[PDB]
Amino acid sequence: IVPTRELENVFLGRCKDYEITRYLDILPRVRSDCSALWKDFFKAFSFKNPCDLDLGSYKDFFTSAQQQLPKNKVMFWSGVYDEAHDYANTGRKYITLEDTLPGYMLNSLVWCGQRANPGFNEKVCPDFKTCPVQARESFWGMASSSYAHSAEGEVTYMVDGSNPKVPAYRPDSFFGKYELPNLTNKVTRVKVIVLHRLGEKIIEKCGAGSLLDLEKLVKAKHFAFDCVENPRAVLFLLCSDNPNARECRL
Amino acid sequence: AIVPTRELENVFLGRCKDYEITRYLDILPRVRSDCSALWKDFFKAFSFKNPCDLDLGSYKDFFTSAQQQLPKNKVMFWSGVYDEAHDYANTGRKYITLEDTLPGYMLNSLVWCGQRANPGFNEKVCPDFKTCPVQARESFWGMASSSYAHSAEGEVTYMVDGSNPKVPAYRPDSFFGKYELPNLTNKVTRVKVIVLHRLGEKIIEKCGAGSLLDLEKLVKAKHFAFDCVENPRAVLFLLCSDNPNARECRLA
Ligand SMILES: Nc1ncnc2c1nc(Br)n2[C@@H]1O[C@H](COP(=O)(O)OP(=O)(O)OC[C@H]2OC[C@H](O)[C@@H]2O)[C@@H](O)[C@H]1O
Ligand SMILES: Nc1ncnc2c1nc(Br)n2[C@@H]1O[C@H](COP(=O)(O)OP(=O)(O)OC[C@H]2OC[C@H](O)[C@@H]2O)[C@@H](O)[C@H]1O
Ligand SMILES: [Cl-]
Numbered sequence: 323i324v325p326t327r328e329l330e331n332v333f334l335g336r337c338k339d340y341e342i343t344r345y346l347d348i349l350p351r352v353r354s355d356c357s358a359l360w361k362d363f364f365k366a367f368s369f370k371n372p373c374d375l376d377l378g379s380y381k382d383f384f385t386s387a388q389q390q391l392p393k394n395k396v397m398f399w400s401g402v403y404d405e406a407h408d409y410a411n412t413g414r415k416y417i418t419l420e421d422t423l424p425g426y427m428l429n430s431l432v433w434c435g436q437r438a439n440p441g442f443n444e445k446v447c448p449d450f451k452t453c454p455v456q457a458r459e460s461f462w463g464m465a466s467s468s469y470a471h472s473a474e475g476e477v478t479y480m481v482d483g484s485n486p487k488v489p490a491y492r493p494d495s496f497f498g499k500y501e502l503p504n505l506t507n508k509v510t511r512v513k514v515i516v517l518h519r520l521g522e523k524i525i526e527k528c529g530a531g532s533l534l535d536l537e538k539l540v541k542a543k544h545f546a547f548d549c550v551e552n553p554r555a556v557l558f559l560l561c562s563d564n565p566n567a568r569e570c571r572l
Numbered sequence: 573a574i575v576p577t578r579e580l581e582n583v584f585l586g587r588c589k590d591y592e593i594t595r596y597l598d599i600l601p602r603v604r605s606d607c608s609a610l611w612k613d614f615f616k617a618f619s620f621k622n623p624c625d626l627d628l629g630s631y632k633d634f635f636t637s638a639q640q641q642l643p644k645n646k647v648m649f650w651s652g653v654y655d656e657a658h659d660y661a662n663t664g665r666k667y668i669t670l671e672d673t674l675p676g677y678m679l680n681s682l683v684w685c686g687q688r689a690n691p692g693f694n695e696k697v698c699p700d701f702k703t704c705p706v707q708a709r710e711s712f713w714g715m716a717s718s719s720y721a722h723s724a725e726g727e728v729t730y731m732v733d734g735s736n737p738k739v740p741a742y743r744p745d746s747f748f749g750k751y752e753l754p755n756l757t758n759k760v761t762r763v764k765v766i767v768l769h770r771l772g773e774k775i776i777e778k779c780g781a782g783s784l785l786d787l788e789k790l791v792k793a794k795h796f797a798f799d800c801v802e803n804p805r806a807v808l809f810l811l812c813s814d815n816p817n818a819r820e821c822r823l824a
Contacts, residue, residue: 326593326594327593328589328593331589331593332590332593332594334586335587335590336586338582338583338586339586342577342579342583343583408662409813554821555813555814556813558809558816558821559809559810559813561805561809562660562807562808562809562810562813563806565805565806565809570809570823571823572822572824
């Protein structure tokens with residue numbers, strides 16, 4: 323597993339590009355400058371064995387980097403990276419974590435500590451599975467927590483309803499572990515979009531299975547809940563990529 | 573009265589670095605110049621000059637250095653349809669657009685201009701689009717499009733608005749007509765037009781008539797193949813996602 327070349331420059335270049343040119347009208351700028359953000363990000367992991375982290379390690383970084391997020395616009399997703407993002411349309415319809423400053427700066431990057439200079443590795447990172455969960459999930463787990471914790475109003479959750487393996491809702495997923503349970507009383511509703519992949523056996527439906535379980539969690543948290551299976555707007559997006567699928571019939 | 577981008581250099585450098593290490597890795601190749609070199613090349617093109625003192629050759633050195641090889645059959649040119657083309661091209665998953673290339677990606681949306689005084693460029697103001705001569709205002713994006721078009725191979729796609737009563741699909745003076753079409757080379761084998769007809773609007777342009785027919789004849793005179801389609805289903809579905817109730821989006 324190969325860490326990212328010149329992490330600092332990449333970090334700082336994204337940070338700066340975001341700062342001046344990205345999400346201008348969609349999300350707010352952040353107070354701390356880009357060098358400040360690097361220091362907080364890098365103190366979390368540097369000069370330590372790669373597994374030497376926990377859920378607190380990147381705390382300062384997420385405090386510094388948390389943006390206020392617009393009412394009613396925040397989205398969560400499980401198992402449907404590409405569809406949730408095509409449909410969230412780069413901040414235009416919904417915010418996703420990847421549109422936010424920390425999400426955007428670290429999206430897809432790979433990096434790890436080493437005890438010895440220069441304090442991070444530049445040849446190899448260990449397999450996440452080798453590290454305790456709280457080190458494996460230190461970074462994206464707390465990123466999820468901070469994002470969820472800032473949401474207000476309606477939130478939207480896009481799931482996979484077409485996977486026999488992974489059920490739609492799961493306590494053990496990142497939405498299950500860090501997001502749904504960090505939703506504050508500023509949240510008024512969870513609106514689930516169930517994604518049913520085209521030409522594939524339908525697994526989870528609203529009102530059933532894991533989607534029932536979540537309905538119950540959502541209500542137990544004092545939120546309103548709704549759930550829709552392939553709403554026309556999403557359906558269409560799925561249909562541009564497989565136009566002959568029966569589901570897209572004219 | 574137009575406001576330039578703050579920290580131009582830092583923005584350039586940020587985007588160039590981001591791009592190099594992380595963008596389009598499996599889709600477009602890296603250039604050999606490093607970011608600082610490409611900046612030098614960019615900067616000398618317009619610095620220490622009248623904001624309006626620029627011609628089609630000013631950025632020649634920057635583009636030579638910045639030009640990637642483009643993959644067979646994936647290049648796309650667009651007219652009057654920014655969002656739709658780029659959504660359809662889907663970040664180089666389906667087609668490449670200028671905006672996915674290195675110079676496109678670094679400079680997209682940025683606003684800049686030179687000044688004869690220290691320090692070579694203006695950060696306060698940049699002139700009204702319409703003051704400078706055609707050759708000077710189109711100096712950066714004109715050459716960008718020439719160079720991109722010059723690098724295209726195989727079958728190119730051209731996505732056009734066919735619902736604009738004021739602007740024909742094909743025009744000798746658009747970017748396509750002026751800079752892309754004339755720089756298509758022997759590497760190119762076919763031009764594939766996609767006419768986009770906006771939902772709930774009068775259809776204005778059709779394959780085999782008007783300016784499209786003119787295009788067909790120009791393309792064939794250059795010994796390239798030609799097709800043209802109107803609202804192909806995959807594109808239609810894209811429009812339909814933004815306007816699901818539109819008459820044209822009926823199912824079953
Ligand atoms: N371009 C990309 N950039 C980044 N990642 C990409 C990617 N493409 C893919 Br493909 N992933 C993958 O998605 C996998 C885990 O997600 P999941 O199982 O689908 O769902 P969750 O557990 O609920 O976690 C998601 C929730 O927390 C974050 C956000 O708030 C969201 O709501 C990752 O391990 C990647 O491999
Ligand atoms: N977000 C953005 N960021 C930056 N710029 C944006 C922009 N959004 C727009 Br909208 N433009 C501008 O729209 C102007 C003219 O486009 P046009 O009138 O629709 O068609 P053409 O004259 O035939 O030129 C098309 C060719 O340009 C290169 C590409 O390969 C394509 O083939 C462009 O010059 C942009 O400045
Ligand atoms: Cl199909």
